[PDB]
Ligand binder design. Structure first.
Ligand code: NAP
Ligand code: FOL
Length: 157
């Protein structure tokens, strides 16, 4: 099965630019916990932004061009990315926007972090009627985390 994992802020005319609006180590810990020992699929730009393989996961990068780093697995289509994962329980698609769009119709589960920051203007719109919330938990900002956030897991209805 295919899952998407992403961090989401509120869309708002007059909000911050999307360059770097939050700092959430707690969110990266949730990301790690829910991706470890699963294959992760990402687009080339997301790969270049992370800048190093995610340890303890099979890293699969989508690019139309040949690969340029032997530390990861390179694929040229969505179907090839899925086939590269083999027979596993859960494939994690980690971004970015173009990649989420292509995989959302295939996905059974969404792991979402709803961050209480307003940004003017990555994740596709999803029909709330087609998804059922199965886990959610709110957390206050703290000394290490700039904003409050809510983890949520949605499964197809
Ligand atoms: O965030 P964001 O949307 O900027 O970027 P992102 O989704 O992290 O990266 C998008 C890049 O991933 C590659 N890509 C995405 N879907 C593809 C597909 N189906 N087949 C081949 N390559 C694919 C393309 O890389 P290339 O520019 O290397 O083709 C594309 O420019
Ligand atoms: N919830 C969510 N949060 C994100 O920040 C996120 N980011 C991406 C793309 N960007 C990134 C950037 C850096 C790392 C990263 O360094 N992760 C380390 C964790 C740090 C820790 O807790 O020690 C890793 O091992 O996963 C991951 C994803 C995709 N979906 C997301 N999903």
């Amino acid at each position: 099965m295919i899952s998407l994992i992403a961090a989401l802020a509120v869309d708002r005319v007059g909000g911050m630019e999307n360059a770097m609006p939050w700092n959430l180590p707690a969110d990266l810990a949730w990301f790690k916990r829910n991706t470890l020992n699963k294959p992760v699929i990402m687009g080339r730009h997301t790969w270049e932004s992370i800048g190093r393989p995610l340890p303890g996961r099979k890293n699969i990068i989508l690019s139309s061009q040949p690969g340029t780093d032997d530390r990861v697995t390179w694929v040229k289509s969505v179907d090839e990315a899925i086939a590269a994962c083999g027979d596993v329980p859960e494939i994690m698609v980690i971004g970015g926007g173009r990649v989420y769009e292509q995989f959302l119709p295939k996905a059974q589960k969404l792991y979402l972090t709803h961050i209480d920051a307003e940004v003017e203007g990555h994740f596709p719109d999803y029909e709330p009627d087609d998804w059922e919330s199965v886990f959610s938990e709110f957390h206050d900002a703290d000394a290490q985390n700039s904003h409050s956030y809510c983890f949520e897991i949605l499964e197809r209805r």
